[PDB]
Amino acid sequence: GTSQWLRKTVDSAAVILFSKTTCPYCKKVKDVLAEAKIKHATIELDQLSNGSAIQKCLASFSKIETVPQMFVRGKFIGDSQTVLKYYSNDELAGIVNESKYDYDLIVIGGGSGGLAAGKEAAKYGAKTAVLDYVEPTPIGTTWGLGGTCVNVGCIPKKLMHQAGLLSHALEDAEHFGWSLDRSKISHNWSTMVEGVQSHIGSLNWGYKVALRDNQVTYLNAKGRLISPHEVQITDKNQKVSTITGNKIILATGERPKYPEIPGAVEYGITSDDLFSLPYFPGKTLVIGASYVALECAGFLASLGGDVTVMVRSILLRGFDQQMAEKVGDYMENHGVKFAKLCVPDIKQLKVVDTENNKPGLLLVKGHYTDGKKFEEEFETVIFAVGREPQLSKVLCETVGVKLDKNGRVVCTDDEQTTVSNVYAIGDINAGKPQLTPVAIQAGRYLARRLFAGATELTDYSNVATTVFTPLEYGACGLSEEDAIEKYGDKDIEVYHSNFKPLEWTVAHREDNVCYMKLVCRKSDNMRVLGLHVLGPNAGEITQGYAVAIKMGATKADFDRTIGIHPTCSETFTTLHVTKKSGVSPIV
Amino acid sequence: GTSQWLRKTVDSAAVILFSKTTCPYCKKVKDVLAEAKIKHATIELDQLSNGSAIQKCLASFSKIETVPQMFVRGKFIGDSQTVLKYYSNDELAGIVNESKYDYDLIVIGGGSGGLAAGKEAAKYGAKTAVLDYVEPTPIGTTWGLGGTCVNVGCIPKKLMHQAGLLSHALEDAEHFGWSLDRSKISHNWSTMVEGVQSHIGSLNWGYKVALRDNQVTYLNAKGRLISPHEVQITDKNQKVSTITGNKIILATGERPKYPEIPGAVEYGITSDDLFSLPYFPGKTLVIGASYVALECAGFLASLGGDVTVMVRSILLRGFDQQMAEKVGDYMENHGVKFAKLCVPDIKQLKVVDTENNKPGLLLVKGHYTDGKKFEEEFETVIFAVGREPQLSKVLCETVGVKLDKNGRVVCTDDEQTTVSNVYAIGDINAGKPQLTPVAIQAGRYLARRLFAGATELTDYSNVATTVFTPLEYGACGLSEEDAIEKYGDKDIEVYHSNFKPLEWTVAHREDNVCYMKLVCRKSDNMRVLGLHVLGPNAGEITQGYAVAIKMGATKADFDRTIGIHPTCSETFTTLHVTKKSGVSPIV
Ligand SMILES: Cc1cc2nc3c(=O)[nH]c(=O)nc-3n(C[C@H](O)[C@H](O)[C@H](O)COP(=O)(O)OP(=O)(O)OC[C@H]3O[C@@H](n4cnc5c(N)ncnc54)[C@H](O)[C@@H]3O)c2cc1C
Ligand SMILES: Cc1cc2nc3c(=O)[nH]c(=O)nc-3n(C[C@H](O)[C@H](O)[C@H](O)COP(=O)(O)OP(=O)(O)OC[C@H]3O[C@@H](n4cnc5c(N)ncnc54)[C@H](O)[C@@H]3O)c2cc1C
Ligand SMILES: CC(CO)(CO)NC(=O)Nc1ccccc1
Ligand SMILES: CC(CO)(CO)NC(=O)Nc1ccccc1
């Protein structure tokens, strides 16, 4: 396998040096390259147990067995004498810049995965271009470099969640002795939006600066792959041209869906529009039941809004349903109205006021499963009914990249498509968790395999999540129902408990609402298959346990670890009530 | 070893039944015991790989080899026929209540460890008494059942820390769009104290109820062990008497120290007085540099107080000193004044006003190492210069319990003292981390070994901690300097990074102040020896990683785990900058 690995590494690396840490000839080559500003990968054979065999395999390309050996785009360039010869004759820059293609890497899509991949590739001498374009929403909203998370996703959504959490901080502060009157304080939507957007703008700019400082070419242009190595680009002035690249990474993400009902596209909005909305939403209907639907409904209500969520069947399909029910129950007790077993069939009553920055007014008609009609007025209607790629705008069908029935790219476990120089990362990679840290790990690990000879793959199993609803829900591993489906009910033990944060005591909040559980496999030493927690700071609670689950933690490992007091997370270290026992989990 | 274990178990268990889950004769004995309200331990031999051998060893006491076999205080009572015989003749209650001693267990001290031990022991039929008495402070402060943490420790200190955190929540809420003016809001100390004390009172009462519901005898009396099995008690009316017990658990904790300078006892206070203080402290001097000193100084300043800390040498001796310096630097930038390299030499200017509930006024004189004099007026002076047991008030020297040079009890790894029926748990156990979850685990695990045949020991290694200063500091494992001392500098690699909470962006708080590091051992697969984090919610961040460290996590385990976004804790999953490299950790 050593020989297979070396051949793949030489063929794909842009500029790579084989070396040993103790060789002065290697040092002199490194210094020459560093003086001429030639970036490159380095593999130190004396730090690999397999290095003596690698040194022998090198001779298949170079006909020598010594170090240093330097390669450019699949071709042996020289040993120490040869490299210094090129340098002395001002020949080196020309050799290390010679390519069949304009770029070693073209990334189509400048989001979480695509930016991480392009920056990492450039570190190893890959001449890289990042393409990004933001197709405007139906009402015309657009934004800058950085993708869905930075502009219309994790970042603004958690900042608005923080604004909602502070409403309860203001309430709590009275009980802890502070002299404010919460009932006389109001929230200004546009003041919050301006602060959120000023931070997003600093991220847009920071990404352009980072690309420039890594020598990456940034093009604000729509990309379309028309053959394995050719990308057609259309710029802001509609000028069309073609660039070529050796490796291609598709990283174009998804966009929100609309239901096919009259008025939906013309009068409703999505999460794409919400985070820069110039007017306050007012009385709002959220249609949908995804984590996006519930997170948005949740902070709108905490800011003081009149909020309804219209649910076709269940909440958070695909998540543990006991946990999802507890999430929704908390929201209903804290102001959110729910129209259950209900679907929509939208009429405009008032146009948005772009002068006084005030919302319009809409009539929503729908129906319930019991036959009753739904008819109610709202100032804003938000659709959160899923997301999808539109790869037909990115990818000519004749190139030969295989898609699945949902239109996502079918990849091997190293992100390779059915076209061997083309790779896909992030939300468009079929079957993978659709999360920002996953896309970043995929893109960075892929760049190292392509251009630095790395072997490490991304591990997509047991990736932890957090839903940032008013009471947050964190999880890692299997839901209880999926564990029982896989192993049978007799092989599953579930430990659980309610708890109360210490911070809730003086504030007079609820006793037996926060909740956690460990779903375990009896016949495998009580292995922890899934961990679930409903409570404040659930993302901070969950993260560290994801390392232990990755390592195969059992119930005994949780028991022998001592808790930190006073914390919410410490309740995981002393769990003892099983579901099979029927004993109540309440405190 | 099976035979040794069985003999120890029979001798010490109060009421114990040997059984198999599938035996109907065992079931009938369980039902009779449950009807007569006789609590007991149960060991199911068919759930132990060693059970066939245990069944044979039982014959050394009973001369039979069948199940069920029932034992009371070291004596075989009978098989199924014999037990039902006693029940039918109204003889059973008399047999299971027969003892040489008043109690199977006496616990001296009703705190974290002592309450946990007494409640667990009672579950297995041990007739238990818990003794608790609170010696008043010099000014007369006293409190109810539950020990140091509940009354004058973790619980009130974290609630007052929460009150201080809310000051910054009020400030932040303006930037997130809320219409309050922080500069017009004040804090009322006594309103906060009343709420904190109402919660503590609910815990005092809940413990008395829990003891009553477990059939534990609670005596509010000072205990003194005068021989291995005799405890002399003095009650609230000064009446003296003697009770006897089979096993004794010493769990009496520590109390604050004072420096030996004029005026210290008469005019200063300690943490024992602070948490129920009827007047606001006003301009305050904290003398000391322990986690107690810095936590108290920190929340007093966040509530709006004029606070000075007087430091003899370093902060947080025994903790990682880079981390301790960052903690103190944050406090100094946020209002706390520090009198460095300074010691005190206290005069009264005004007596405390017990009518208008206002503090007095004090003159503090001291001196610096450079020869300058310290002289300044303060309304309150708090000493936080360490804590100590006073076991000469608990333990007659003739009993034979060995103490160390600091006066703590010298124990084996199962908490046994040099007197074989006497055990020590919690803060008075020499050499152990002095923390509430440690005391609870020790007491509960000990009760199960004494009265239910358990074998599991408490693991005191790599127990995680959190200091609840204004910016919190969490840790698990070795400090960097201790790791280098143990293994040498060439064998240690340190990965580190600054970070900024997303919540701090819109609030305009500091860029490169939060900080984390992983201290690793190169020659052991980059094993993580210590983890350290300075930031919000540091206790929630740290707890879950303590399970992975207990399991032997390496740097590779941290790398392959995916982060949760956006969280502070996720920065641990992507660390790459080493200290040896000299690259800056800033963002
Ligand atoms: C409301 C919401 C909240 C979320 N919250 C979280 C959260 O808390 N945590 C989390 O981990 N994940 C969260 N996510 C998911 C996260 O945003 C995505 O998983 C992540 O952004 C995926 O990144 P990506 O690189 O696959 O694509 P994207 O980030 O979508 O970036 C793709 C980019 O390519 C551009 N593009 C498309 N076609 C072309 C073309 N032809 N030419 C050029 N450019 C093109 C797009 O306009 C976009 O800029 C959230 C998502 C949403 C919608
Ligand atoms: C200010 C402060 C803050 C702290 N914060 C934390 C924190 O955040 N987290 C943490 O884990 N730990 C914290 N601790 C430590 C924690 O309080 C102790 O580790 C824990 O209380 C130890 O419990 P214990 O059972 O050993 O003794 P204690 O809790 O002290 O209980 C012993 C009891 O025995 C009584 N007693 C003494 N002598 C006799 C006698 N002769 N007869 C009868 N009764 C007697 C005492 O009055 C007391 O009620 C803090 C401590 C302090 C002082
Ligand atoms: C406890 C329980 C179990 O089902 C009711 O008994 N909760 C819900 O049903 N919560 C919910 C809230 C809003 C929308 C959908 C579900
Ligand atoms: C960065 C550094 C390093 O020493 C100063 O250069 N910090 C301190 O010294 N912090 C500190 C604050 C209060 C009391 C004691 C120490």
Side-chain angles (χ1 to χ4, degrees):
Chain A
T2 291
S3 152
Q4 282 82 333
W5 165 86
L6 190 60
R7 179 177 29 140
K8 169 190 127 73
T9 295
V10 170
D11 291 352
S12 74
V15 193
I16 191 168
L17 182 71
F18 295 83
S19 184
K20 298 168 195 275
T21 62
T22 56
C23 173
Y25 295 89
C26 295
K27 190 86 226 323
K28 170 70 154 103
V29 170
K30 290 168 177 170
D31 288 348
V32 157
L33 293 183
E35 202 205 15
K37 302 190 226 293
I38 297 164
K39 297 184 285 179
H40 59 92
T42 307
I43 288 169
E44 307 288 357
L45 298 179
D46 60 309
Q47 321 246 57
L48 297 167
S49 78
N50 200 223
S52 268
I54 296 170
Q55 199 161 353
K56 296 172 183 73
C57 286
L58 277 166
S60 304
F61 296 85
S62 63
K63 280 164 158 199
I64 58 157
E65 299 174 64
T66 42
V67 289
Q69 299 190 37
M70 170 180 171
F71 293 79
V72 170
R73 303 193 181 78
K75 148 175 317 203
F76 171 71
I77 296 310
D79 62 6
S80 181
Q81 182 168 333
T82 295
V83 177
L84 278 57
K85 184 272 173 166
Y86 292 142
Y87 194 45
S88 301
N89 292 256
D90 300 315
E91 290 159 354
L92 191 49
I95 281 154
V96 302
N97 286 333
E98 170 178 25
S99 178
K100 196 174 300 103
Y101 309 105
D102 299 323
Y103 296 96
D104 290 298
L105 172 64
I106 297 173
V107 184
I108 313 182
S112 299
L115 289 168
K119 281 190 271 133
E120 183 77 5
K123 295 206 199 333
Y124 306 105
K127 189 178 166 81
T128 303
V130 170
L131 280 42
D132 195 58
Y133 166 77
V134 173
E135 184 65 36
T137 75
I139 60 163
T141 317
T142 196
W143 51 81
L145 182 65
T148 288
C149 183
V150 163
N151 293 281
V152 289
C154 342
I155 297 302
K157 105 166 164 40
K158 209 197 180 187
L159 290 165
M160 302 208 168
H161 173 63
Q162 174 71 356
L165 291 176
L166 289 164
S167 152
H168 306 98
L170 298 180
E171 297 172 2
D172 288 357
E174 312 190 7
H175 300 282
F176 281 91
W178 292 92
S179 70
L180 81 162
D181 190 349
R182 168 68 184 88
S183 75
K184 275 142 181 23
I185 293 166
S186 61
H187 187 258
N188 186 318
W189 167 271
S190 65
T191 300
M192 169 190 77
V193 167
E194 287 294 313
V196 168
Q197 288 297 332
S198 186
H199 178 65
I200 294 170
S202 79
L203 301 177
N204 302 146
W205 175 256
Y207 283 122
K208 284 183 295 186
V209 178
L211 291 191
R212 158 201 100 200
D213 292 359
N214 276 272
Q215 296 69 55
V216 173
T217 300
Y218 169 53
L219 306 176
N220 181 29
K222 183 194 168 147
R224 180 188 172 67
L225 185 74
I226 65 190
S227 76
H229 294 282
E230 293 172 286
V231 184
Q232 165 187 279
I233 60 181
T234 309
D235 72 13
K236 97 160 306 302
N237 306 323
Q238 291 315 288
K239 169 183 145 183
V240 174
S241 63
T242 294
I243 51 164
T244 63
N246 185 21
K247 312 301 194 193
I248 308 290
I249 292 175
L250 308 177
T252 51
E254 299 187 328
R255 298 294 290 272
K257 289 152 94 163
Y258 288 75
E260 295 233 302
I261 61 173
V265 175
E266 303 84 347
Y267 308 129
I269 63 162
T270 72
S271 59
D272 282 354
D273 308 289
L274 175 65
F275 296 118
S276 65
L277 215 57
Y279 58 82
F280 59 90
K283 183 186 176 191
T284 299
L285 176 63
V286 179
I287 295 165
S290 57
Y291 77 85
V292 169
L294 299 182
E295 286 177 347
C296 292
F299 67 72
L300 289 173
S302 286
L303 299 174
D306 177 350
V307 180
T308 304
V309 177
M310 164 189 295
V311 177
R312 185 184 291 261
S313 59
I314 64 183
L315 302 182
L316 300 174
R317 187 176 291 281
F319 295 85
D320 183 291
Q321 283 292 293
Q322 176 191 28
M323 282 332 273
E325 274 155 41
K326 290 183 184 291
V327 164
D329 283 349
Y330 183 87
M331 279 164 78
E332 192 167 39
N333 283 320
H334 290 271
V336 180
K337 294 164 271 171
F338 286 89
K340 303 181 226 279
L341 302 181
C342 191
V343 300
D345 293 306
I346 324 292
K347 289 174 171 165
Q348 182 178 60
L349 308 176
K350 226 188 271 205
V351 175
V352 161
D353 186 342
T354 67
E355 284 180 17
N356 284 280
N357 278 311
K358 288 167 91 213
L361 186 63
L362 305 164
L363 187 69
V364 180
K365 297 183 78 194
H367 64 273
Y368 295 94
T369 61
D370 66 11
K372 287 184 191 54
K373 295 305 79 179
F374 180 98
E375 180 169 320
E376 194 169 344
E377 295 177 2
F378 297 94
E379 292 175 289
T380 296
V381 179
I382 307 178
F383 293 102
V385 294
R387 295 171 59 80
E388 70 193 350
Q390 303 102 49
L391 279 175
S392 54
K393 316 166 154 173
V394 173
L395 184 70
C396 185
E397 40 160 68
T398 60
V399 176
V401 173
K402 176 196 188 45
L403 302 188
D404 73 5
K405 54 150 145 213
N406 315 135
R408 284 161 191 110
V409 184
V410 181
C411 301
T412 69
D413 72 2
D414 66 339
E415 287 78 59
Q416 197 180 47
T417 76
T418 54
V419 182
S420 313
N421 68 296
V422 180
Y423 298 75
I425 61 173
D427 287 355
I428 66 170
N429 188 330
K432 307 308 187 299
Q434 300 191 306
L435 306 161
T436 277
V438 174
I440 292 171
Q441 183 102 331
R444 292 190 181 136
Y445 279 26
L446 174 61
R448 302 173 183 162
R449 298 193 301 275
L450 291 178
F451 299 115
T455 59
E456 182 89 286
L457 299 182
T458 298
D459 181 354
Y460 295 95
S461 72
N462 294 314
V463 174
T465 61
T466 296
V467 171
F468 294 96
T469 37
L471 196 55
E472 298 176 3
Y473 165 43
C476 184
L478 293 180
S479 67
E480 189 175 323
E481 57 264 49
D482 285 354
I484 291 164
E485 172 62 50
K486 184 158 191 302
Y487 294 113
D489 187 71
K490 309 55 55 183
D491 201 21
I492 297 301
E493 192 84 284
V494 181
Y495 300 90
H496 65 157
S497 185
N498 286 114
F499 62 102
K500 186 180 195 168
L502 181 55
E503 293 75 19
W504 285 19
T505 59
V506 163
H508 297 285
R509 296 177 169 294
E510 304 99 306
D511 280 338
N512 282 301
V513 165
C514 298
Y515 177 81
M516 48 153 81
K517 68 177 177 183
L518 290 182
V519 177
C520 301
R521 186 180 183 199
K522 295 191 197 202
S523 68
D524 187 27
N525 293 133
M526 217 65 81
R527 199 77 61 197
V528 171
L529 304 174
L531 171 149
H532 300 268
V533 55
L534 172 72
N537 306 313
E540 307 299 351
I541 295 175
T542 299
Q543 174 73 91
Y545 292 108
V547 182
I549 290 166
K550 178 62 53 196
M551 289 163 81
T554 66
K555 183 49 164 61
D557 296 315
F558 276 71
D559 291 338
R560 67 200 177 108
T561 308
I562 308 302
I564 307 174
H565 181 68
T567 64
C568 293
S569 186
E570 71 176 314
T571 301
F572 274 114
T573 65
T574 55
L575 290 174
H576 63 100
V577 178
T578 68
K579 284 199 178 177
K580 168 215 162 73
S581 73
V583 169
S584 175
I586 71 183
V587 159
Chain B
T2 291
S3 152
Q4 282 82 333
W5 165 86
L6 190 60
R7 179 177 29 140
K8 169 190 127 73
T9 295
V10 170
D11 291 352
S12 74
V15 193
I16 191 168
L17 182 71
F18 295 83
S19 184
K20 298 168 195 275
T21 62
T22 56
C23 173
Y25 295 89
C26 295
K27 190 86 226 323
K28 170 70 154 103
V29 170
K30 290 168 177 170
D31 288 348
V32 157
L33 293 183
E35 202 205 15
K37 302 190 226 293
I38 297 164
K39 297 184 285 179
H40 59 92
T42 307
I43 288 169
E44 307 288 357
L45 298 179
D46 60 309
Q47 321 246 57
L48 297 167
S49 78
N50 200 223
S52 268
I54 296 170
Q55 199 161 353
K56 296 172 183 73
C57 286
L58 277 166
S60 304
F61 296 85
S62 63
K63 280 164 158 199
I64 58 157
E65 299 174 64
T66 42
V67 289
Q69 299 190 37
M70 170 180 171
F71 293 79
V72 170
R73 303 193 181 78
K75 148 175 317 203
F76 171 71
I77 296 310
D79 62 6
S80 181
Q81 182 168 333
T82 295
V83 177
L84 278 57
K85 184 272 173 166
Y86 292 142
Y87 194 45
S88 301
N89 292 256
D90 300 315
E91 290 159 354
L92 191 49
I95 281 154
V96 302
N97 286 333
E98 170 178 25
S99 178
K100 196 174 300 103
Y101 309 105
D102 299 323
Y103 296 96
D104 290 298
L105 172 64
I106 297 173
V107 184
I108 313 182
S112 299
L115 289 168
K119 281 190 271 133
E120 183 77 5
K123 295 206 199 333
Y124 306 105
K127 189 178 166 81
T128 303
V130 170
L131 280 42
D132 195 58
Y133 166 77
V134 173
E135 184 65 36
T137 75
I139 60 163
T141 317
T142 196
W143 51 81
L145 182 65
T148 288
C149 183
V150 163
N151 293 281
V152 289
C154 342
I155 297 302
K157 105 166 164 40
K158 209 197 180 187
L159 290 165
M160 302 208 168
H161 173 63
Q162 174 71 356
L165 291 176
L166 289 164
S167 152
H168 306 98
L170 298 180
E171 297 172 2
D172 288 357
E174 312 190 7
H175 300 282
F176 281 91
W178 292 92
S179 70
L180 81 162
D181 190 349
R182 168 68 184 88
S183 75
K184 275 142 181 23
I185 293 166
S186 61
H187 187 258
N188 186 318
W189 167 271
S190 65
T191 300
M192 169 190 77
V193 167
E194 287 294 313
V196 168
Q197 288 297 332
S198 186
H199 178 65
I200 294 170
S202 79
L203 301 177
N204 302 146
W205 175 256
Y207 283 122
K208 284 183 295 186
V209 178
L211 291 191
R212 158 201 100 200
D213 292 359
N214 276 272
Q215 296 69 55
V216 173
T217 300
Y218 169 53
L219 306 176
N220 181 29
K222 183 194 168 147
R224 180 188 172 67
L225 185 74
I226 65 190
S227 76
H229 294 282
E230 293 172 286
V231 184
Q232 165 187 279
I233 60 181
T234 309
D235 72 13
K236 97 160 306 302
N237 306 323
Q238 291 315 288
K239 169 183 145 183
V240 174
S241 63
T242 294
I243 51 164
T244 63
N246 185 21
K247 312 301 194 193
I248 308 290
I249 292 175
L250 308 177
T252 51
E254 299 187 328
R255 298 294 290 272
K257 289 152 94 163
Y258 288 75
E260 295 233 302
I261 61 173
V265 175
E266 303 84 347
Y267 308 129
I269 63 162
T270 72
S271 59
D272 282 354
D273 308 289
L274 175 65
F275 296 118
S276 65
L277 215 57
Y279 58 82
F280 59 90
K283 183 186 176 191
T284 299
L285 176 63
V286 179
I287 295 165
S290 57
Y291 77 85
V292 169
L294 299 182
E295 286 177 347
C296 292
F299 67 72
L300 289 173
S302 286
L303 299 174
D306 177 350
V307 180
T308 304
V309 177
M310 164 189 295
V311 177
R312 185 184 291 261
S313 59
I314 64 183
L315 302 182
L316 300 174
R317 187 176 291 281
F319 295 85
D320 183 291
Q321 283 292 293
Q322 176 191 28
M323 282 332 273
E325 274 155 41
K326 290 183 184 291
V327 164
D329 283 349
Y330 183 87
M331 279 164 78
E332 192 167 39
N333 283 320
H334 290 271
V336 180
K337 294 164 271 171
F338 286 89
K340 303 181 226 279
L341 302 181
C342 191
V343 300
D345 293 306
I346 324 292
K347 289 174 171 165
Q348 182 178 60
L349 308 176
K350 226 188 271 205
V351 175
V352 161
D353 186 342
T354 67
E355 284 180 17
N356 284 280
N357 278 311
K358 288 167 91 213
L361 186 63
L362 305 164
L363 187 69
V364 180
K365 297 183 78 194
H367 64 273
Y368 295 94
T369 61
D370 66 11
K372 287 184 191 54
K373 295 305 79 179
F374 180 98
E375 180 169 320
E376 194 169 344
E377 295 177 2
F378 297 94
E379 292 175 289
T380 296
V381 179
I382 307 178
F383 293 102
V385 294
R387 295 171 59 80
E388 70 193 350
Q390 303 102 49
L391 279 175
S392 54
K393 316 166 154 173
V394 173
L395 184 70
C396 185
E397 40 160 68
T398 60
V399 176
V401 173
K402 176 196 188 45
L403 302 188
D404 73 5
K405 54 150 145 213
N406 315 135
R408 284 161 191 110
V409 184
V410 181
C411 301
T412 69
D413 72 2
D414 66 339
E415 287 78 59
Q416 197 180 47
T417 76
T418 54
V419 182
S420 313
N421 68 296
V422 180
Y423 298 75
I425 61 173
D427 287 355
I428 66 170
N429 188 330
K432 307 308 187 299
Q434 300 191 306
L435 306 161
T436 277
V438 174
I440 292 171
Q441 183 102 331
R444 292 190 181 136
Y445 279 26
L446 174 61
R448 302 173 183 162
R449 298 193 301 275
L450 291 178
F451 299 115
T455 59
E456 182 89 286
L457 299 182
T458 298
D459 181 354
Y460 295 95
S461 72
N462 294 314
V463 174
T465 61
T466 296
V467 171
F468 294 96
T469 37
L471 196 55
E472 298 176 3
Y473 165 43
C476 184
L478 293 180
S479 67
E480 189 175 323
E481 57 264 49
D482 285 354
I484 291 164
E485 172 62 50
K486 184 158 191 302
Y487 294 113
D489 187 71
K490 309 55 55 183
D491 201 21
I492 297 301
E493 192 84 284
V494 181
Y495 300 90
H496 65 157
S497 185
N498 286 114
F499 62 102
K500 186 180 195 168
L502 181 55
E503 293 75 19
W504 285 19
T505 59
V506 163
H508 297 285
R509 296 177 169 294
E510 304 99 306
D511 280 338
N512 282 301
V513 165
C514 298
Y515 177 81
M516 48 153 81
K517 68 177 177 183
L518 290 181
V519 177
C520 301
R521 186 180 183 199
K522 295 191 197 202
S523 68
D524 187 27
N525 293 133
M526 217 65 81
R527 199 77 61 197
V528 171
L529 304 174
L531 171 149
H532 300 268
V533 55
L534 172 72
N537 306 313
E540 307 299 351
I541 295 175
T542 299
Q543 174 73 91
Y545 292 108
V547 182
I549 290 166
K550 178 62 53 196
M551 289 163 81
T554 66
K555 183 49 164 61
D557 296 315
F558 276 71
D559 291 338
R560 67 200 177 108
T561 308
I562 308 302
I564 307 174
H565 181 68
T567 64
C568 293
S569 186
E570 71 176 314
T571 301
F572 274 114
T573 65
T574 55
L575 290 174
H576 63 100
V577 178
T578 68
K579 284 199 178 177
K580 168 215 162 73
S581 73
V583 169
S584 175
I586 71 183
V587 159

